[PDB]
Amino acid sequence: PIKPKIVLISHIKTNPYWLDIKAGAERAAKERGAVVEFLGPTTASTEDGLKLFDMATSAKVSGIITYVQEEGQYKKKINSAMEKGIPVVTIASDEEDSNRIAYVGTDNVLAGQVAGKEMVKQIGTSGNVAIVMGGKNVKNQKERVEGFTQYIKSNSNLKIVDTDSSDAMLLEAEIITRKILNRNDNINALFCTSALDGIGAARAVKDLNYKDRVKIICFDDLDDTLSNIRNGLVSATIVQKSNEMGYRAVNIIMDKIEGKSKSLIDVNVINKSDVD
Amino acid sequence: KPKIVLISHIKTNPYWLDIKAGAERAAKERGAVVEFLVSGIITYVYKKKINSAMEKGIPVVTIASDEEDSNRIAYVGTDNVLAGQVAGKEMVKQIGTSGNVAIVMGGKNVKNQKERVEGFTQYIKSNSNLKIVDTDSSDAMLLEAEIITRKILNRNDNINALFCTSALDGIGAARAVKDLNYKDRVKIICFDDLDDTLSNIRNGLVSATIVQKSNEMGYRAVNIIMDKIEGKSNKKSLIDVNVINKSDVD
Amino acid sequence: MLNNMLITNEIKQHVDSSLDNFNQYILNGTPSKKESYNNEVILAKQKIGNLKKNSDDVNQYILRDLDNTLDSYIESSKNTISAYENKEGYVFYYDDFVAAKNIASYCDAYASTLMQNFLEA
C-alpha cells in the first residue's frame, strides 16, 4: 500500500550532520507511516538545491522539507509549492519571508540558558564572566547572549563584564579575548557565542598563559573545540541536535497532512566526559 | 550587615538544610547574615502575619508553599509546567518516541499536578509519537493510587510507562506494577524523593524522579530579599528541577 | 522483465516526442504538431498506466512521481498553449514555456530511475 512521500533537501547530501537529520526524519516517517526521500547537492549550491525543490514540487509529493541555501532566493518556489497544496518546512536555515508552514531549528535563547546553567556548574555563582561575540548584531548570537544573560542574572551573582569590540575592527576572536583578559585581571570564564569565537578564545587563553584559570564555554563541535575539551582548555560546548530536527520536521509535515495542525529544538552539552 | 530570618518547614528535613545552604551562599555573596528557625523574612507555609510584617516595610518572601493572598514580595517555588516537560524528556529518554504511556494523577484539579500534566503532555506531543492512554477513574472512585494503576495495566495490554503526577501516585503506581508482576516491563516516572521512591529507583522499579531544587530556592529567596532591601529591583520566580535516575541516586 | 524496460523507453520517447511537437507549435504555429503533442502525452500517460497495474512496492513510488511529473508537464504546457492562443507575447508565457521543458526532463529523470530499477535478478 502506498505511503505519503516527504522530500528532504539538505545542505550537502554527504554531510554527517545532514545524515543525522535524515535518520531522525526516517524515524518519524516510520512512526507516522510515510516514506522520506533524501536529496541534496554534492556541492553547496542554491541552484542545485532550487532544482531539487522544483522536481519535488512537480512530482506532487506530500510535503517538502528543505534547507535554505540563500535567504530571499527561496520565497518564490516555496510559496508556489504551498499554493499547489504542498506543505513546506524549512530546516536549520530559514526563509522567514515566505509561507513556510514552519521553521525547524535550534532554540538559541534556550541554548543560551543551557550555556548559563553549565557555566554556573563550572565556576559557581560568584565571580566575573565575559562574552566573546563575533557578530554583535547577528540575531542568533544576540539570542544566545539574551538566554545566557537572563539565566546568569536570575541564578547567580556572577558579574558580566562588558567589552567594546570596535577596535579589533569588529573583531577576530583571538584579538578581542586578549583585550578582555588584559583589561580585566579577574575573569573566571568566557562565554563564546559562536564556534569560531570559541576557537579564538581558547587560543588566546592559551597564549596569555591562563589555561585553567579561565574556563571557556562555547558553541558547536569543530575538531579543535572537541580537542580543547579533552585537553582541559575548553570546559563545555553547546551542540545542536540534528537528529531531532529531522524527526520534528517530518512530524510537522505529517500533522499538516492529516489536518492535526512549534518549532525550535533543544541542544546538548559536551564536557570532558562525553568527548568519548 | 542586614539580618534575614528563615522560617522553615521545621529543622527536620535535609531539604530544608539544603535551603539553608543555598540561603547561606547567597548571604555571603550579598553581604548578609541568615538566621534559620530584622531586615527580612523568608518563610515556609498566614495572611496578615505576612501583611503587618509587610506593613512595617519588611520584605517577606514565601518559599515552596505559596500564600498568594498576601503582600508577600515574591513567591519562590518550582516551575511545575517546566517540571512536567523535564518529565516528558526523561520519559522519551527511557522508552523512546513510540509506544504507550498512561498518567496516574491524584488531584485532577490540583494546580501543580495540572501544570505537571500540561507540561508533560505538551512535551510528549511535540517531541514524540507516544500515545497517552486515557482511563476513566470513576470506579476507582476518586482514586487510590494502587487501584487506578491496576485498572490501567489490566485494561491495556501494552502500556510502556506511567507518568505519576505526585509522590503518593508514584508510591501507589510502583506497588501496583510490582504486585501485577510488571516490574521492568513498565517504566515509571514520578515526583519528589521519599525514601520509598529512592529505594524503588535503586531497585529498578521506578525509573526516574523529578525533585525540587531546594538549595536554589533558598539561594534565590535571599537574593530577592536583598534586592528589595537595596532597592536595586529587579522585581514571580519559579525554579528548575532535578532528575534522579538509577545512576545518580548515590 | 525486458518488456518492462521496453515500455519505459516508449514512455520516455513519447514524452520527448511530445515536447518536440510542443516547442515547434509554440514557435511555428502549425496546428498539426499541437495535436501530435497531445497524442504523445496521451500515449505516455497510457503506458505509465500499464506499468502501474503491475507495480512493485518499490517502483510504485517512482511511478507515482513519474505519473505526477507528467501531469505537471501537461499542465504547464497547456497553460503555455492557452496563453499563446489568445496571442499574448513570449514574455507572458516564457514562464510556463521553460517550466514545460524543465518538467519534461524531470519525467526523463524518473524514467531512467524507473528503468535502472528494472535490472533485478
Side-chain angles (χ1 to χ4, degrees):
Chain A
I2 196 81
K3 298 195 300 285
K5 182 185 276 216
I6 302 179
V7 164
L8 180 60
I9 303 163
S10 56
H11 185 85
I12 301 315
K13 161 176 222 177
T14 56
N15 191 320
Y17 184 87
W18 288 90
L19 291 168
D20 284 326
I21 298 200
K22 174 185 163 216
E26 280 171 339
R27 183 170 67 259
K30 185 148 35 68
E31 299 174 355
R32 297 285 297 263
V35 297
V36 172
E37 205 185 350
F38 181 65
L39 303 192
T42 57
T43 320
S45 173
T46 290
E47 316 160 341
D48 300 343
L50 278 176
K51 173 178 187 160
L52 293 177
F53 196 92
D54 215 64
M55 304 187 44
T57 298
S58 292
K60 298 180 181 181
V61 296
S62 295
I64 307 179
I65 306 168
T66 196
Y67 175 77
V68 187
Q69 184 67 36
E70 281 177 42
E71 85 163 9
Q73 298 312 121
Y74 278 67
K75 171 186 180 170
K76 212 192 173 172
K77 297 214 169 299
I78 284 184
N79 289 359
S80 179
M82 289 291 318
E83 191 275 333
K84 318 176 165 267
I86 307 179
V88 181
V89 168
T90 57
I91 185 173
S93 181
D94 194 14
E95 183 61 285
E96 205 176 7
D97 176 356
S98 83
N99 308 122
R100 97 206 168 183
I101 233 56
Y103 162 63
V104 173
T106 301
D107 192 333
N108 295 313
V109 179
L110 174 64
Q113 306 180 352
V114 171
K117 179 180 287 170
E118 182 68 19
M119 192 165 285
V120 170
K121 166 166 174 294
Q122 293 288 340
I123 67 168
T125 48
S126 74
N128 315 287
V129 165
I131 307 183
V132 180
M133 178 184 197
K136 168 102 211 166
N137 288 130
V138 184
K139 181 173 81 179
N140 69 337
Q141 290 182 47
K142 282 195 295 193
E143 290 176 341
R144 272 116 109 167
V145 166
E146 163 192 343
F148 176 84
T149 302
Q150 164 267 329
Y151 185 96
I152 293 298
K153 282 195 181 166
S154 295
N155 295 286
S156 80
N157 286 305
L158 295 171
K159 291 171 180 298
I160 291 176
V161 181
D162 287 319
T163 304
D164 183 358
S165 77
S166 291
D167 78 275
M169 308 301 137
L170 251 31
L171 75 79
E172 135 135 79
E174 306 179 37
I175 289 182
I176 194 62
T177 305
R178 279 161 204 251
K179 185 186 193 181
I180 288 158
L181 298 178
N182 284 329
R183 278 203 182 259
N184 309 285
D185 39 285
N186 220 75
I187 300 304
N188 306 114
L190 303 173
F191 172 55
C192 312
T193 55
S194 64
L196 296 188
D197 285 317
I199 294 177
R203 291 174 174 180
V205 161
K206 177 75 183 165
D207 302 345
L208 293 182
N209 194 231
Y210 288 139
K211 174 170 173 175
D212 106 270
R213 252 189 72 186
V214 181
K215 301 218 179 169
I216 306 177
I217 298 200
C218 52
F219 284 81
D220 304 336
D221 93 6
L222 310 170
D223 295 342
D224 279 8
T225 295
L226 295 181
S227 188
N228 290 338
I229 292 180
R230 285 185 305 258
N231 276 15
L233 190 47
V234 165
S235 312
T237 190
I238 276 62
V239 165
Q240 300 186 341
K241 296 178 92 179
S242 317
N243 191 279
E244 186 68 31
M245 292 184 312
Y247 181 86
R248 178 88 159 262
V250 177
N251 281 309
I252 292 184
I253 293 285
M254 294 305 299
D255 280 3
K256 191 66 183 189
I257 283 176
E258 304 168 348
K260 302 166 178 167
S261 278
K262 277 15 168 159
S263 63
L264 303 181
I265 308 304
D266 278 14
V267 291
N268 286 319
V269 177
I270 293 80
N271 33 45
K272 194 216 177 104
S273 325
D274 333 307
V275 204
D276 307 324
Chain B
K1 299 190 186 161
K3 191 183 167 74
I4 304 180
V5 167
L6 180 60
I7 292 121
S8 178
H9 180 77
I10 285 321
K11 161 189 160 178
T12 56
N13 196 25
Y15 276 28
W16 294 92
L17 292 169
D18 282 326
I19 286 204
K20 118 148 165 165
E24 280 172 337
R25 180 161 52 76
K28 188 167 42 67
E29 300 173 356
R30 288 276 244 133
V33 291
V34 170
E35 222 186 290
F36 171 59
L37 304 206
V38 296
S39 295
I41 309 178
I42 306 166
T43 188
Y44 175 74
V45 186
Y46 278 112
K47 207 200 150 242
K48 236 192 169 290
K49 292 295 185 64
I50 279 184
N51 287 10
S52 178
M54 283 292 318
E55 202 173 343
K56 322 214 157 268
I58 296 180
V60 179
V61 166
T62 66
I63 184 170
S65 316
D66 191 13
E67 166 90 328
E68 212 178 11
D69 60 0
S70 25
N71 311 317
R72 93 231 156 332
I73 286 302
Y75 164 67
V76 174
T78 301
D79 193 336
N80 297 316
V81 175
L82 172 65
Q85 306 180 352
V86 165
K89 183 185 290 169
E90 181 67 18
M91 176 67 81
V92 168
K93 166 166 176 166
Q94 294 287 339
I95 66 170
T97 53
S98 75
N100 312 288
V101 155
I103 303 184
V104 179
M105 177 182 24
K108 254 114 182 167
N109 284 296
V110 180
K111 177 199 292 144
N112 69 338
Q113 291 185 44
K114 279 195 296 192
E115 291 177 341
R116 279 153 178 181
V117 165
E118 159 193 345
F120 175 85
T121 303
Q122 161 267 327
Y123 186 93
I124 285 299
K125 283 196 178 168
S126 294
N127 294 83
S128 82
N129 284 304
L130 293 175
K131 291 162 181 175
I132 294 176
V133 186
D134 286 320
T135 298
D136 181 2
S137 76
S138 288
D139 72 76
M141 287 191 183
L142 279 108
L143 64 94
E144 153 124 78
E146 306 179 33
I147 290 183
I148 189 64
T149 306
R150 278 165 171 72
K151 183 188 189 68
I152 289 160
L153 298 176
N154 285 330
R155 278 206 70 189
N156 310 284
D157 278 298
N158 178 336
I159 296 305
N160 305 116
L162 304 176
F163 172 56
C164 310
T165 58
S166 65
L168 294 188
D169 286 319
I171 299 178
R175 291 173 174 180
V177 163
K178 175 77 181 167
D179 304 347
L180 291 181
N181 197 230
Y182 288 139
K183 173 167 178 166
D184 226 322
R185 187 197 313 187
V186 179
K187 301 292 182 79
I188 307 178
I189 296 203
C190 52
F191 288 86
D192 286 13
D193 104 337
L194 311 173
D195 294 344
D196 277 6
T197 299
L198 294 179
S199 310
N200 289 337
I201 298 176
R202 284 185 206 98
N203 291 332
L205 189 45
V206 166
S207 309
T209 13
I210 279 63
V211 299
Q212 98 189 353
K213 297 186 93 178
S214 317
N215 195 281
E216 309 60 352
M217 294 181 54
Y219 179 84
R220 171 84 50 98
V222 174
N223 278 311
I224 290 184
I225 292 287
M226 291 299 296
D227 277 2
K228 192 66 183 58
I229 282 177
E230 303 168 346
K232 66 175 50 165
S233 285
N234 275 123
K235 30 181 159 50
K236 297 132 174 202
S237 68
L238 304 181
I239 307 304
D240 191 33
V241 289
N242 287 317
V243 175
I244 307 306
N245 33 44
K246 196 203 178 170
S247 62
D248 61 357
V249 199
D250 307 305
Chain C
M1 330 197 317
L2 190 147
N3 38 353
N4 276 327
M5 312 174 161
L6 176 48
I7 183 154
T8 298
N9 286 335
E10 306 189 20
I11 288 157
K12 157 87 165 192
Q13 244 289 326
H14 283 308
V15 176
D16 285 339
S17 165
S18 153
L19 174 63
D20 186 41
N21 285 317
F22 165 76
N23 290 321
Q24 282 168 336
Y25 175 68
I26 286 292
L27 277 48
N28 296 332
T30 89
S32 69
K33 310 226 137 228
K34 168 177 163 175
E35 256 288 3
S36 274
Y37 147 77
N38 247 295
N39 292 126
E40 292 300 302
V41 314
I42 293 184
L43 289 164
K45 197 69 173 138
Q46 267 285 307
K47 289 182 190 172
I48 290 165
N50 318 128
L51 277 195
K52 292 214 302 173
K53 20 192 56 185
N54 299 340
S55 318
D56 289 349
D57 164 50
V58 176
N59 52 41
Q60 64 167 349
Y61 289 97
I62 315 158
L63 272 173
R64 175 177 57 185
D65 293 338
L66 177 52
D67 192 19
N68 281 322
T69 301
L70 190 57
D71 285 335
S72 301
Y73 163 64
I74 289 171
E75 178 195 346
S76 265
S77 57
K78 286 182 20 169
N79 283 332
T80 310
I81 292 176
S82 194
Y84 170 78
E85 279 182 0
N86 52 34
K87 334 149 185 184
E88 297 173 354
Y90 175 77
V91 197
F92 323 90
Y93 64 69
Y94 166 82
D95 324 272
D96 314 283
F97 198 19
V98 350
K101 7 206 168 173
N102 287 336
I103 297 157
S105 46
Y106 298 163
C107 298
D108 290 8
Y110 293 110
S112 315
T113 295
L114 175 64
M115 185 157 43
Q116 194 80 300
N117 187 37
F118 276 145
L119 278 186
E120 330 88 359

